Ligand binder design. Structure first.
Ligand code: FAD
Ligand code: FAD
Lengths: 971, 52, 125, 63
C-alpha cells in the first residue's frame, strides 16, 4: 500500500460531534461491566493497602512549588559524599535559617555542582519557599518531609551530574528490570542537541549490554524526545528540521535496533504533532530499519486527532511492511495546550476539556489499537485502575500488548494485576539522566501528581469512596452537548461579554499556516506646512459634529473598524511585512492588537461616555457629570508598531469625541494611509480624521499650532521633551500631553529559575523583532552561580535564530527599519566591543540587518542609552548585592518593563515593592502586552501615563463638565 | 454650569469643580477623576502555570 | 476605592494580571489666598492620599492658616517626613517647581503663573 | 511537672468511655485534631481567644 500523505487532520474539531460517536460506542454488556467492576475494585483495594510523590504532597499538604523545592533540596543532600554530613545539615541548619540560601544553593547545584558544598543567626524572618514551609508546618516537619523527598529521589530517579554517572548508578551480570524514560527535552543550543544525542546513544549501549536473551516484546526500551535532538524543533523551521534531525533520529534507531530494543518517540505539544509525524515517517522509511519490530511512538488520547494519528501510524506500518510498538497515553501538556490556544486566539482546543472525554477517547483508541494486532503491538501507559480494567476486558486475552507505568507510580496496581492475571505484561520505566535536566522534568511530573482530577491523587485520598473511582466516563458526560467543559471559554470568547477577541493562527497546523502564507503572498508625497495647518483647521471644523455624535455611534465605528481589519488581515499583514520589516508572527500579532485596540476602546468608550454620572446631592437639585471631547488631537506615531500604535492612539482620541490630525513616522506612511482609509470606511467622518505625512518638521508644525487641544505621542524621549516645550511655550491653554517613550528594560534572574526557560524568555524579549520593541530586554542581571550556564545558553540559542527576509516563514529576525538605525547600532556594537566582554556576535546577511549581540558589562552604569536593536547586555551579580542591582535599575531614570525570574515568592514581591516600572513580567517574556490584559506604559523617562490598552486611558482625552440644575420649581 | 441658582459654592463630591481652556487642565477637584492623576499605574503579570 | 486593592484583568489561564496605582514621588502643592484652608487641604490631602509625599507652599498672604492645617494633618496621622510646609514669595514657589527631583505639581492660582510653572517643568531634562 | 493518666477498667465499661473520648478527637474545633492537620498553619493555632471574640456582644454563637 501507499506511503500516507503528510498528516493534516483538523486541529480543533467540535467536542459534541466527537461525543456523539464515542458515547454510544462505549456501551458494554452487563457481564462485561461486571468483570470490569470487579477487576478495578481489586486493583484499587490493593492500591489502598511504601510511598509515592502524591503521598508526600498529600501528607504535608504541599503545593507543587513546595514539593519541587524539597525534592531539589533532597537531591542535593543525597549527593553529599558523607551521609552523616547531610544528617548534620538536616538537623542543625535546615529549618533554622538561611532559608533562601538553601533553596538557591540546592537549585544552583543542579547546573553548577561546585556551587553547593556558614553560621545561622537566631530569630531569622522565615522567607523563601522553605521558610514559608517552616512557618506553616514547623521546622521538624520540614526535616521529615525532606527525608521523605530523599527516599523518593533516591529510589525513583536514576540521576547523576553526567549521563555516565546516571548510567553507572542504574546498573543491575544480568538484566535491568526497567526501561529508560530519559530526562532530556527542548535543546536550546546546538551543543545541547549533541549532548542529548550522546546521552541517548550511551543509554542504549548500557541498556543493550544488559538486555537479557528473550525476544521482543520482552526486552528493555528507551524513550526519546524530538525536541531534545533539535534546537529549533518547530513548524516554521520544518525545512531545516527534515534535513538535520532525521539522520540523528535514524542513527539512534539503528543503535537501538542493533540491540533489538524497544525504541519510542515521545509525544510532545499539540503544535509539534504534524512535524514529529513527518520526522518519524521519513526516519521509519529508511531500509536500515527493516527486520526490527521495536520502533515506535507515543500517541496522546487527550487530543481530538488521536484516532487519526493511529490510522496514519498503521498505514505507515503497512506501507513500509514493519511491526511497530505504539504507546497510548492520555497526555502530559493539558494546561499548556489550553493556555496556548487562548494566547494564540485559536478557534478551539486541540485537546478535550473534560477529563471524562479524555478517558472516553482513550478507551475508544485502545479498542482501535487492539484490533491492529499483530502488526501493531499496543502499550497502554496509565496508572488508572479503571482504565486498566477496561482495556483488559476489551482485549479478551492478554497477548500482543503490554501495559506501562513509571517507577514510583502504579506499583500496587500492577502487582495486583499480575496476581489476578499471570499472563499480563507490564513495562516499568525509570527516569534517567543528568541533574541539569531534572528541574524541567520534575515540574511536568508534579503537575499530574498534584492534580485533583488525577486518578492517582484521588485513590490516595481515603475520602474518595472506591465506587466514585469507578464511575464510567460515559456516565459523567451523559449528553454530547455536555462534552466541552462549561467553565472554559473558547479563545474567541475569552473576554465575553465585554468584547470579542481577535483571531490568531496555529502555525503548527500546516493547513492553517499554508493558507495564511498563501493569502499574504497574494497581496506617498510629504505634506507642506500649509497643508498641515489646513488639516488642523479642517479638523477644528469637524470637531463640533463629531463631539456631539452619540458615544454608541462612535463605538460602532471602532467595532466595524475591528471587523474590517480582521477581514483584511492578509492585506495588512503583507504591509507590515514589506513596509515594516516584520516576521509573520509579529505582523499577525500587530494586526490582532490593532483590532483589539478598537474593540476595547469601543467597550470602554460606552462605559465612560455612554451616559452621565449622577452625583448625590440635596433634594430639589440635580447634579450630573459628563465627559466631552477636548478639541483637535494631534496623534504622532512611531515606525515600530506602525499599525497598532497608530490606530490605538487615533481611535482613543476619536472615541473620546475629538477630531484628529495624525502624523505617522516617515518610514511607515503607507500602512497609516490604509488604516485611515479603513477608519473612514468604518464610519469615521472625513471631517473628524486627517492624515498628514512628513518629517519631524511637519510633526512640529502640528504641535506648535495654537488651536490644538492635545497631543498623543509615542517615540523618542528627546522628541517628547521638545514637543512638551513647544506646548508650554504657547500663551494659550495648557493642553494634555500623553507621551510613551523608550526604556532601558532590565531582567533579574536568580538561581532558582530554570536556565532553559529563562534562556527562551531572554532570547524572545531581547531579539524578537530585532529588538525593535520599546518593551525589549536590554539589560540582563543574572546570579553568578548560574551566570555561565545562562549566558552560554542564551548565546547558543541566539545562534539558532534565522536572520533574513521577513517574508520567508523560517526567518526569526528581520531587518532593522533603515540605514540610519543600522549605523547607530553598529556604532554601539563597535564601542561595546572595546568596552565590554563579547559573548556573542552573530553573522548578519548583506543588507539592512543587525544580528543579535550579547555583551557582558562590568557594571550596569556602562549602559547609558536605550539601544534600539537586537543587543543584549548582561551583568552577573552576587545574591547579597541585589540592592546594588535595584539601585542600578533606579539610576537610569527609565521605567517601562522589568522581568523577574525566580521560584521564590518573597524575592519576587520584594522586587515588585521596590521598583516603579510600568510593566512587571514574572517568569515569562517581557514583550507582547495584550490590550485590556496588560495595560502597557511606563513612567519616569519612560512616559507620562495613562497606560494605553488600560482603563484610565480614554478619560485623559476628554474633559469633564458638571451641570447643576435647581429643580425645586418642578416639585 | 449652574441653572436657575447661584454660580458659587461648589460642594465636594456634588459639583466636581474646575474648568478648561484658559481656566484649567483638569481633572476636577472634588470629583472622581482627581486622585488617579496624582498616581501612576503598574501592571504585574505572573506566569502561574507551574503552580497548576 | 482607587488604591485599596488591585484590579484583576481578564486574561489567559495559567497567568495573573493585576493593575495597581502607586504614589508618584514628591508633589509640590501651591495654593492661593482666597480659599487658604480648603484648597490648601484639598490639593495636599489628595496628593498624600495617592501615596505621594508633599512640599506645600501656601500663598504669601495666608501662611498662618496653612501652618495650622499642616500641624493638624501631622497630628491626624501624616508623618512629619511625608508633609512639609515652605513659606515665601513666588521665587520660593519657583525654587520648588524647578527642582529636578519632584514628581508633579498641583497648582491653584493665576493663569500667568501656571504657564511659567509649566515652562519651568518642560525646560527640565 | 506533668501527670499522665491511663484509662483503666473492665470491658463492660469501655463503650461508654470510648464514645465520649471519640467526640473530642473527632471534633473539628479540637486543638489536637487541627494540630494534626497540616493544612492548618502554625500561626492559626496561635490565634488568641480574645481576638476571635473581639466584642462582648459576639460572645454567644450566632448560629
Ligand atoms: C511510561 C509513560 C510514558 C508516557 N509518555 C508520554 C508522552 O510521550 N507524551 C505525553 O503527552 N504523555 C505521556 N505519558 C502520560 C502522562 O505522563 C500521564 O502519565 C498520563 O496522562 C496520566 O494518565 P492516567 O491514565 O495515568 O491518569 P488519570 O488521572 O486517569 O488521567 C489524567 C489525565 O487526564 C487528562 N486530563 C486531565 N484533566 C483534563 C481535562 N479537564 N480535560 C481533558 N483531559 C484532561 C490529562 O491528560 C491527564 O494526564 C506517559 C505516561 C507513562 C506512564
Ligand atoms: C486528665 C484529664 C482529666 C479530665 N477530667 C475531666 C472531668 O472530670 N470532667 C470534664 O467535663 N472534663 C474533663 N477533662 C476534659 C475533657 O476530657 C477534654 O479533654 C478537654 O475539654 C479538652 O480540652 P483542651 O484544652 O485539651 O482542648 P481544646 O481542643 O482546646 O479544647 C476543646 C474543648 O473546648 C470546648 N468547646 C468545644 N466547642 C465549644 C463551643 N462551641 N463553645 C464553648 N466551648 C467549646 C469543649 O470543652 C472541648 O472539650 C479532662 C481532661 C484530661 C486531660
Amino acid at each position: 500500500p501507499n506511503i500516507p500523505p503528510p498528516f493534516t487532520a483538523p486541529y480543533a474539531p467540535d467536542d459534541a460531534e466527537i461525543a456523539a460517536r464515542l458515547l454510544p460506542a462505549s456501551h458494554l454488556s452487563p457481564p462485561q461491566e461486571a468483570r470490569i467492576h470487579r477487576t478495578a475494585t481489586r486493583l484499587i483495594e490493593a492500591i489502598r493497602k511504601l510511598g509515592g510523590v502524591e503521598d508526600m504532597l498529600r501528607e504535608f499538604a504541599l503545593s507543587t512549588k513546595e514539593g519541587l523545592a524539597l525534592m531539589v533540596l533532597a537531591e542535593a543532600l543525597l549527593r553529599v559524599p558523607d551521609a552523616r554530613t547531610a544528617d548534620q545539615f538536616i538537623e542543625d541548619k535546615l529549618g533554622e535559617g538561611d532559608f533562601i540560601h538553601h533553596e538557591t544553593k540546592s537549585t544552583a547545584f543542579l547546573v553548577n555542582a561546585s556551587a553547593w558544598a556558614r553560621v545561622i543567626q537566631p530569630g531569622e524572618t522565615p522567607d523563601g519557599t522553605i521558610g514559608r514551609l517552616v512557618k506553616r508546618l514547623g521546622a521538624p516537619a520540614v526535616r521529615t518531609a525532606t527525608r521523605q523527598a530523599m527516599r523518593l529521589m533516591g529510589n525513583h530517579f536514576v540521576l547523576g551530574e553526567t549521563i555516565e554517572q546516571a548510567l553507572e548508578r542504574g546498573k543491575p551480570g544480568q538484566k535491568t528490570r526497567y526501561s529508560f524514560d530519559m530526562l532530556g527535552e527542548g535543546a536550546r543550543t546546538a551543543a545541547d542537541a549533541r549532548r542529548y544525542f550522546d546521552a541517548y546513544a550511551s543509554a542504549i549501549e548500557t541498556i543493550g549490554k544488559a538486555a537479557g536473551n528473550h525476544a521482543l516484546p520482552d526486552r528493555p526500551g528507551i524513550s526519546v524526545k524530538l525536541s531534545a535532538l533539535h534546537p529549533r524543533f518547530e513548524a516554521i523551521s520544518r525545512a531545516r528540521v527534515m534535513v538535520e534531525l532525521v539522520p540523528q533520529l535514524l542513527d539512534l534507531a539503528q543503535r537501538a535496533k542493533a540491540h533489538d530494543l524497544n525504541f519510542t518517540v515521545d509525544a510532545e505539544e499539540a503544535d509539534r504533532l504534524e512535524l514529529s509525524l513527518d520526522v518519524i515517517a521519513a526516519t521509519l522509511a529508511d531500509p536500515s530499519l527493516k527486520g526490527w519490530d521495536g520502533f515506535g511512538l507515543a500517541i496522546q488520547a487527550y487530543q481530538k486527532r488521536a484516532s487519526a494519528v493511529i490510522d496514519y501510524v498503521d498505514a505507515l506500518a503497512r506501507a513500509h511492511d514493519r511491526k511497530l510498538m505504539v504507546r497510548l497515553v492520555k497526555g502530559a501538556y493539558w494546561d499548556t495546550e489550553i493556555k496556548r490556544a487562548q494566547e494564540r486566539g485559536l478557534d478551539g482546543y486541540p485537546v478535550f476539556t473534560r477529563k471524562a472525554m479524555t478517558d472516553l477517547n482513550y478507551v475508544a483508541c485502545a479498542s482501535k489499537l487492539l484490533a491492529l494486532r499483530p502488526r501493531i503491538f499496543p502499550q497502554f501507559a496509565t496508572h488508572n485502575a479503571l482504565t486498566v480494567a477496561t482495556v483488559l476486558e476489551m482485549a479478551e486475552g492478554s497477548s500482543g500488548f503490554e501495559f506501562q507505568r513509571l517507577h514510583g507510580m502504579g506499583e500496587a496496581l500492577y502487582e495486583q494485576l499480575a496476581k489476578d492475571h499471570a499472563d499480563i505484561a507490564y513495562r516499568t520505566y525509570a527516569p534517567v539522566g543528568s541533574h541539569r535536566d531534572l528541574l524541567a522534568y520534575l515540574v511536568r511530573r508534579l503537575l499530574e501528581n498534584g492534580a485533583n482530577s488525577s486518578f492517582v491523587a484521588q485513590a490516595a485520598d481515603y475520602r474518595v469512596p472506591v465506587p466514585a473511582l469507578l464511575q464510567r466516563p460515559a456516565d459523567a458526560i451523559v449528553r454530547p452537548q455536555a462534552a466541552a467543559h462549561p467553565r472554559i471559554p473558547l479563545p474567541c470568547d475569552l473576554f465575553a461579554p465585554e468584547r470579542r477577541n481577535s483571531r490568531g493562527v496555529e502555525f503548527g497546523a500546516r493547513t492553517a499556516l499554508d493558507q495564511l502564507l498563501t493569502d499574504v503572498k497574494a497581496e506617498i508625497a510629504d505634506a507642506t506646512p500649509d497643508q498641515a495647518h489646513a488639516a488642523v483647521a479642517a479638523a477644528r471644523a469637524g470637531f463640533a459634529g463629531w463631539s456631539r455624535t452619540p458615544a454608541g455611534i462612535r463605538a460602532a465605528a471602532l467595532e466595524q473598524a475591528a471587523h474590517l481589519l480582521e477581514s483584511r488581515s492578509a492585506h495588512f499583514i503583507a504591509l507590515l511585512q514589506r513596509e515594516g520589516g516584520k516576521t509573520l508572527d509579529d505582523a499577525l500579532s500587530e494586526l490582532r492588537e490593532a483590532a483589539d485596540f478598537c474593540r476595547y476602546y469601543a467597550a470602554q468608550g460606552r462605559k465612560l461616555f455612554g451616559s452621565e454620572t449622577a452625583m448625590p446631592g440635596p433634594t430639589g437639585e440635580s447634579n450630573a457629570l459628563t465627559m466631552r471631547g477636548r478639541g483637535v488631537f494631534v496623534a504622532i506615531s512611531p515606525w515600530n508598531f506602525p499599525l497598532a500604535i497608530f490606530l490605538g492612539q487615533v481611535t482613543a482620541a476619536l472615541m473620546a469625541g475629538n477630531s484628529v490630525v495624525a502624523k505617522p513616522a516617515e518610514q511607515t506612511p503607507r500602512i497609516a494611509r490604509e488604516a485611515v482609509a479603513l477608519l473612514h470606511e468604518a464610519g469615521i467622518p472625513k471631517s473628524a480624521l486627517y492624515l498628514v505625512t512628513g518629517d519631524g518638521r511637519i510633526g512640529a508644525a502640528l504641535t506648535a499650532h495654537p488651536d490644538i487641544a492635545g497631543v498623543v505621542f509615542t517615540g523618542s524621549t528627546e522628541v517628547a521633551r521638545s514637543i512638551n516645550r513647544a506646548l508650554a511655550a504657547k500663551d494659550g491653554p495648557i493642553v494634555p500631553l500623553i507621551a510613551e517613550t523608550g526604556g532601558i528594560n532590565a531582567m533579574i534572574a536568580d538561581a532558582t529559575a530554570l536556565p532553559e526557560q529563562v534562556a527562551d524568555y531572554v532570547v524572545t524579549s531581547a531579539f524578537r523583532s530585532a529588538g525593535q520593541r520599546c518593551s525589549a530586554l536590554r539589560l540582563l542581571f543574572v546570579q553568578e552561580d548560574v551566570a555561565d550556564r545562562m549566558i552560554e545558553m542564551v548565546a547558543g540559542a541566539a545562534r539558532e535564530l534565522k536572520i533574513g527576509d521577513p517574508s520567508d516563514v523560517a526567518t526569526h529576525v528581520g531587518p532593522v527599519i533603515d540605514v540610519e538605525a543600522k549605523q547607530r547600532l553598529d556604532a554601539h556594537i563597535a564601542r561595546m566591543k572595546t568596552e565590554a566582554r563579547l559573548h556573542f556576535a552573530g553573522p548578519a546577511p548583506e543588507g539592512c540587518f543587525v544580528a543579535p549581540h550579547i555583551f557582558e558589562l562590568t557594571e550596569a552604569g556602562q549602559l547609558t542609552e536605550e539601544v534600539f536593536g537586537p543587543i543584549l547586555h548582561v551583568v552577573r551579580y552576587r545574591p547579597e548585592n541585589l540592592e546594588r542591582v535595584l539601585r542600578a535599575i533606579e539610576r537610569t531614570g527609565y521605567g517601562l518593563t522589568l522581568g523577574v525570574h525566580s521560584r521564590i515568592d518573597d524575592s519576587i514581591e520584594a522586587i515588585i515593592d521596590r521598583v516603579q516600572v510600568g510593566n512587571i513580567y514574572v517568569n515569562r517574556n517581557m514583550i507582547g502586552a495584550v490590550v485590556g490584559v496588560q495595560p502597557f506604559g511606563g513612567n519616569g523617562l519612560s512616559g507620562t501615563g495613562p497606560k494605553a490598552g488600560g482603563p484610565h486611558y480614554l478619560a485623559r482625552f476628554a474633559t469633564e463638565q458638571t451641570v447643576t440644575i435647581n429643580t425645586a420649581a418642578a416639585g
